[PDB]
Structures are given as structure tokens and as C-alpha cells.
Amino acid sequence: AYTNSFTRGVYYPDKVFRSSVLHSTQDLFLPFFSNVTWFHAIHDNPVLPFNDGVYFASTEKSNIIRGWIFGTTLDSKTQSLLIVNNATNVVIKVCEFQFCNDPFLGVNCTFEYVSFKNLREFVFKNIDGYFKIYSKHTPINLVRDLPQGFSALEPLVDLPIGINITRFQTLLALHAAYYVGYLQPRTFLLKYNENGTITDAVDCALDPLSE
Amino acid sequence: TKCTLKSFTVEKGIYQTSNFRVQPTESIVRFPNITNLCPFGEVFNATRFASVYAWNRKRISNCVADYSVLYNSASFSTFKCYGVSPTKLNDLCFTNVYADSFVIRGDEVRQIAPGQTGKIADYNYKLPDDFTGCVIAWNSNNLDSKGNYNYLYRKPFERDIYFPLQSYGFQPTNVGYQPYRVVVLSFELLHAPATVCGPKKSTNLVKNKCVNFNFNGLTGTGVLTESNKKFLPFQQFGRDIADTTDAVRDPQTLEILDITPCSFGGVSVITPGTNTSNQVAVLYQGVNCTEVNVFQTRAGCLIGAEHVNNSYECDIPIGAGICASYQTSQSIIAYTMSLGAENSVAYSNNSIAIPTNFTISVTTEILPVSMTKTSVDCTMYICG
Amino acid sequence: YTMSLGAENSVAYSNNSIAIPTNFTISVTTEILPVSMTKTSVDCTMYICGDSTECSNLLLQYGSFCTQLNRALTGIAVEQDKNTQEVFAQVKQIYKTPPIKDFGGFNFSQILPDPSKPSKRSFIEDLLFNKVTKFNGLTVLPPLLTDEMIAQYTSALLAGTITSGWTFGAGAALQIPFAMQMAYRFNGIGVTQNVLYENQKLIANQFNSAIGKIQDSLSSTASALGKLQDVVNQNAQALNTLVKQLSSNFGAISSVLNDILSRLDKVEAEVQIDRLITGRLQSLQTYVTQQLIRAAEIRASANLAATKMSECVLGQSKRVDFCGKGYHLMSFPQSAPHGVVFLHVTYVPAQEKNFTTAPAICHDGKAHFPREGVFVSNGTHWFVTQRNFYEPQIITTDNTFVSGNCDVVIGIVNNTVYDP
């Protein structure tokens, strides 16, 4: 299944304050009005391609989705980034795992690290071996699907792992609605208000008016 | 004014002779208040360096780095740096530093650079083409040769664990055939709060005064002030339209400082001709007199001219309705210009004025019509 | 679509037909002109090498580029004051209006000063001032004349124009009653002055209503100021371009010059800094070249505005379509940000009758010709009348002059001529 991304998936491109200004930036972004693939883990945890980078989201009330796996082959022949959220902690490893036959959470580790009503949005990308993560949490007024309205994600993490990633998967809690979109290299014109905050954007390649 | 015009005679007028800038009173140094010494003395003494097919990366973080301990050492066969000069490493600072630590054949040290190529740099140690850091290496024949056959070889920072897997045979009798230990320091300037900085001490902070600041190795000069620029918690600096820094967060106390550049302006000199007087007045354009007879015009602080309460024709222009002249008791005066004598025309619905007489005036008007016909032989001008 | 050039009109010409306007409309047409632009100056050394000695010592190797750029911007900055002086300072004395405004029913209260204001602008000058809207070594110098001084000059020019006709331009101002000034201005367009005095209330009401429409036009339609607002926008766009070019790398490791001087030691750094100097200097030469060419366009507009002030405000113009559409009567100047606005007052003829006409009239052998105006017929009778307003008069030896006889002239007509 599919749905329209609308204007979702904008994020602060760098750790720099700017205000009352329209800023042109080129980066991996989710294209405006692209189609996110959609999933329903009832009565749905496949391995996806990673492409250049991933936007990811879920619409929530019970927090079933709790992690991700990334790599080339995910089968102990090479290192593979595991990301887990476990009740309060975040736990991250790159070990040469052979994962479960059907990866879920029960209700050479060269790098390791530690730290519906809700929509939670994430972006993952790899550049020069730096795995970067951005996110946002928000309430939603529409229960059924992604809201046709604007908000932007902020950075949380950067992992200097150097590992090749071309595939990924997501992890579910057992004794669920989630979305995936692919980033592309796009020029975005970003509107910053008085308060350091991105309030609107133009994906310049979308249509001739956006150009 | 004479030196500006390249002349001993100066005509009556106003001349921009120089540009004034308020000088920084003192320097301000603001590094994070962190005190651990960095672990480089461990890295350069590690018991077993990695094979180059499987090179180790150590994250240096949360520490103070005296790079002189490395750079002064007699050990290193090379210390080449590609985005920084090694003399500056104690003054500059970083979010993290990554040490890539491994062993290679001495001939192959040539492959470790930005933009270089060859079988290591292709298969198992590609640097970024914009590599911002230093390659530190030395001959390790006496440490690592035996032969010894353990040292195996096969995008930027690609790790890739018949097939291409092979090892050097390091006997101590091997010179370019010998093992070399190499540590490549890659520096994370890419923005966040700094956590790897040189041993240079922080001063106290100063506000509301012109100072030569340095925050985490961002040097500059300006008037620092508390500000309503409400940074989001991840943001470390704010940038102007010019990409010059416009606000900062102090790394020891997380308040946001506006940076405004120190006051500056053109130094106009107002003069009657040298063929009249040697007295002059100075207009510091746009500058407030508290930042420099003295008189605040709307055009700038004016010095050496008397403000006069009358008004006259504009003899030498200044700006914003102010003009100046040299007048008797002789001195330069500055005054609001008179636009002309005021005249209530004697109008009423049945009065007319008719001239009973005339004057045949003659008024000269002068117009340029041509200018000196130059020609330049561009090859003789350029090449002689 | 293929554009249409205008409505299509076969004019009803024939060898004996003339159309004469039986009535007029006084029209007031606003013309807006740029006169100056913001007096910028850039300290080229602080733009290129801001607060670095290490960069400034390299910039001295480029010789007198920096000083001739500061000279070129200073030449532009001074000629903005010259332009502003030439447009407004055409009046030798600050004339001021009588206390009582007995201008024969004409009502200048919307264009004359209002003493209620903090700067003594008129009502229409306030609309114009409402509808029209950098630490990197950039600076803005003030104009030599404040907007209050420009409002004193537009007040003086206007108070002269109202109380004294053209006379305040040519010599000492002579008072003349405003109805009699307009009567001269009607003779100036070849309309016999009794056409004013017989219609003075109508002409005053047309003028007062036309001034009223200017306030509604300027209040509703901000795009009318487009010439002045574009001069502001072009200068802001040029400065924003000049400033954004500081952020460009030009092939150096970083455009922020303090990065180069903190990261690199002198013999490594000077190679990088010379790229920034070369790029920034070429960018500043580009800005100064654009400003010199733009300043020449503003000077052409200021010379035109000064010419309109001289010929159109201080006088009455015979130059067709120079002083707005229609036959010109008079113009009132109004100040605006970096410009001037003329309210050109003009006579437009408005209600035609077709008539039969003739070049001459045969009386007894003699061919009579009109002294001024044209011979015209309503079909049964022949009248002479002035060219620009239908006013039939009996044909007489006072209205006409003889020359030669009937045999010489093509299309002459027989009629009596009354000899008073």
C-alpha cells in the first residue's frame, strides 16, 4: 500500500541558528508529495532497501515499534548496525550478528553506544561513514493517516561507524501502523521565522512554480 | 588629506581621508571547562596495531589535547597535515577527533593522502578528497618485523572485511619493504559543542565592550551582548547573510550572545583651501562621539567645528541639512543650511503686481562637450 | 493570445467636415520620477579583508584598485546630492502661501502643507511616503537635504505656482488672483479666456474632483509607485548580492577568512587568502560597475525631472505629451522617497459636434479668412469659432481678414460678412 507524504520530512540541515530568512540548501530530503510505502503488522516487518537514505514514521498509541537493523546482508558475514529503544534506554551496536529468523522484541562489536494520538518521525542517512539521525514527535488531529500540514525534524545522533548499508528492517514488540519514504538529493528553500525555526519549505524540483 | 590627494595644495571641500575602527580593548578566550588529558600517548604505544584490511578507529572526545607531545617527537617519519597547520593545533578545536590506527609497508605510505590512488587506497583505506587532518607515521621494523605474516591487506572510510586477501612478509632484514605504524588523525570540525580542545586557558567573559573574542577556536572581534536569539538546544552558532558568525553560545555557560562588529566609519576632513587656512574639522561618519570642540551631527561625530545657531548658504556640505564654512575670530563653523530667504507673496483675490521696468541680465552657462582622446596600445602597456 | 494593439477607429475624415469639441474635461495625471538613490559607500579594505592585517598586507600588492573603488562610490554618492539639488532648488526664495485660501473655488488643501504633521508634508506627499518602503564595511550616508527640506522646497515651488503663475521662475514673484492665472493658462492653450470665467465653478469642481481621485488612486493602488519602489528594490538587491558574495569560497578552503587564519600558518594561508581577495575584489568591482551604470540612469531621470520642474512647474509647456496627456495648464510638484511626483493639470477636449467647414468665405469678390479659429456651419448658417471650444460668432470684418479673390482658393463658400 501507499500514501502521499505531503510536505512532511523537512529537517534542520546544519547545527546553525538562522532567523527571518529564506535559505537555499542542497541535501538528501524526502521529496514533497512523494509516496511513502505503508505497513500494518496485524492478522509486517519485511527487509527494505535503504537507497540513499530513509525517512521513517509511525502513528501510535501503544508503542509497538521499538527498533531498526541496517547493513548489506544482515547475516554475520559483515558488521550490521542494530538500533533498539528499550522502555527508557536507547541501545546501539554494530556486531557481526546472525539475527533472529523473524526479528521482534519480547515484552565483532567494533562500535557500541547507549543513551492513534502520536506521530513520531525519523530520518536516517549515511555520509562518509557517519550515520546521522534526526527526529520529531507530535500530536495528530487526523487519526487515520499522515497530516496534510507542516513540521520539521531536528538532529539527535551521529555514529562514526564507516559500515556499508544498502538494506534495513524494523523491530516490533510482542508477548501496527508505520510508513517509509526515500530521500533524494534536492535543493530545498527553507523559511526560518523570527524564532530560529523552520516554518515552511519549497522542494525546488517539484514543479515549475516551485522552481 | 594632503597624502590622500597626493598634493601639497588642498582645495576647499570635504575629503574622506581614512576609515576609523574602534579597537578591541582586550581578548576573550572561551573553551569548554573540561580537564581530562587526551589519550594520544596510549594510541602511539598500543600493543598491536591493526592490519590495514581491518584498521581500528578510536574516538578521542571529552579531553584537552597538547598536540606538541606528538609534533615535537623525534619518532615520526611523516607528520603531513592537509586542512590545518600542525603549529595551530593547540589553538584550534573540535567536536571529536578520530584516530585511524594501523600498519603498512613503508613504500605504501605514499597512498595515504586525500585524492591519492593505489590498491590500499582503493580497496581498504580511501581518505576523503577534502581530508581535514594529519597523517602521522614511522618505521616500526624493530617493533613489528620477526618473518611476520599477520599484517593483511585486501568510498571514504570504506571498511571491507583466488581472493584479494594477502599479507606482507616482514623480516627485520626487509628499507621501503619494512613495516610502518601509521595513525591518521581526522578532525571533526563539523558543528556541535566542542569536546576536544588544546591546552590554551579560557579568560572570563566580557559584555557591552569591543573585544578580540575566541569561542571554541572561532576567532573574531566585536561587542558581545546578551540576546533574545533563542537557539534550539542542538544549535551552537548563528550565521549572518555573509556566513560570518552573528551570535554564539558560550561553552562554559549556555547563554546566547549577540556579536555586533565594533563601531566604524569614514573620517572625512572638512577644510577651507590651504590657500586660506591650515585649520580643519573632522567628521567621523555614522560614529557616536562617545565612541571616539565636539558636536554630534546626524551624519556623525564632528570635531574642530563650532556649531552656530544661525543658518547660511551651504558652503561645504556635510549631511542631513548640516553644512560648514570658514568665517569670522576666524574658525570653521557648522550650521543647518538656509534654503533661502522666506517670502510671503502678497496674494489676494483682486490684487496684481505688474513690473514697471526690467533688467537685461546676461547669465553664463558652461557645458562639457568633449574630453581628452586617449588611446592605449594594450600590448605595450601590459608587456613593454 | 495574439495581443490587440488597441480599439480600431476609422476617423470620419472628408474634405469639408470638422469636429469641434463643445465641452472639456480638466484632467490631473500623476507622473512619478526617480531623482536619487541611497548614498551607499563601501570600505573596500574592510569588505575584502575585514579586521585582518594578514589579509590587508596582501591587498596592498593589488595597488590602487581599492582607493579608486572608494573614489567611484564617492562620486556616485555626491551626484545624488547634485541631482536632488537640481530638481528641487530651482526656487531662489522660500515662498509661502497667504493665510486665507481664496483661490476662486480651486482647492489645493490636499497638495499644500498640513501644519498638523511632524514634518510639514502635504496629504498627497504622505500617501507617497507611505506607499514606498551590512556591518561588512558597507555604510549608508545621509542625503544633504532632509525630507523636511525637500518638503520646504516643494512647498515653496507650489506656493509660488499658486500665488504668482510662472513669474516666480522668471523674476520676482508677482501676485495674481488664481482665476486670472488660469485665464492666462487658457490663452496659453489657445482657448479664449472668457471660456474660463464663464465656466469657473465647473472648472474648479472638475479640478477639485480630479485632485480627489489622486488620493483614491494612491491609497488603493500601491503599484502606481513602481518606478520609485523598483529603484529601492534594485539597490537593496545589489547590496544583498554584494554581501552574499562574502560567503562564496572562490576556490579557498573556507569563505570565513578567520577559518583560514586560525587553521593555516602564513605560507600555506596566503595561497588561500589570495583566492578570497581575488574573488571579493572582482565582486566589488562588479558592484561598483553596476552602481556607476545605475547612477547614470538615475542622473538621466533627475535631468528629466529638473527639466519638468523648470518647463512644466515654473512654466506652461507647449511640448505635446511632455507634461501629461492633453493640452498642458500647470503642474504641482510633490516630494516622494528618492524621487518627485508631478500632478500635471491638463485640458482635454471632450464632446464633439461634426460640422460642415470651409477654408475661406467669398463675400463680394473678396475671399475672407478667419483671424483665429475656423469657419463652421450648422447646415443653415455660417459662424467663425475658436479651434478648441465650440463658441459660434457671427462672421464679420473684425473676425476675418481679406486676401485676393474667389478664383484662387479651392473649396471657398459664398456667404455674407457683416461689417459692424
Place this chain on the structure above:
Amino acid sequence: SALGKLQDVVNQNAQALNTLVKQLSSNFGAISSVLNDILSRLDKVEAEVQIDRLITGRLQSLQTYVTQQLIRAAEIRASANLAATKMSECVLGQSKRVDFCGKGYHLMSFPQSAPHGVVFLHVTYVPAQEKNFTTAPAICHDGKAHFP
């Protein structure tokens, strides 16, 4: 100081040439501004790097001068078209154009030559000694309104 406009056009051109000549003394980042130093001190593969800096600088300096002279020549041409218009309307005619042909009502103008320019002696009638009078737009005779 009456000749100020003509003396200024002479000064601007002399100032431009003296600037263009003095730029030959500038290094532009070469090891000397005297081209014979480079050619007497260096062999060609070394020298051509230095000479290319002088060529780039001197050529950019000459492009700047020619750009100034093109813009200045347009200013002088606009003044020459104004002077030609004054000759045509003001000398060869009499002008109704208020304040075009000197202050006052224009009678005639005499041209006189000057270095790089022209000077017009505009002869103008200026009215000079008022009397006040009571006035009227029209006069009643026997019922008829008479106008002048």
C-alpha cells in the same frame, strides 16, 4: 571657479591616466612589478607563473580604466547632446522653454568656445520694479462683459 565643470573634466581624465600608469608599479602578487626583473632572474618554466600574475593584474587594471572611460564618455555625450540642443534652440532660435535658456525670459544666446567645452552667454529679460494694482477679470459696460 566659474570654469569648474570644464576643469573637472580635465582633472577626471588626468586622474584616471595617472592611476592607470601608477598601477604598472603594483606587484599583483608577482615577485617584482618590473617585468625585466622576472625575465632577468628566472628561467621560463618558473618565470611564466610570475608574468601571468602581472598580465592578469595589468589587464584587469586596463579593463577597469576602459570601463570608467566608457561610462564617463556617456556622461560627456549626454552633456554634448544638451549643448547641441542649446546651440540649436537657444542660439539659432529663441526659446519658450522656461529656465532652459538661462534664468528670466529668454531673448538670445551667444556661444563662446572653451577648452573641452562651450559657454553660452544667455541674454534674458528679467522684470524688476513692481507696482501693486487692483484688478478685475472682466468689465461691465452696457450689460456686456468686456475682456482684455
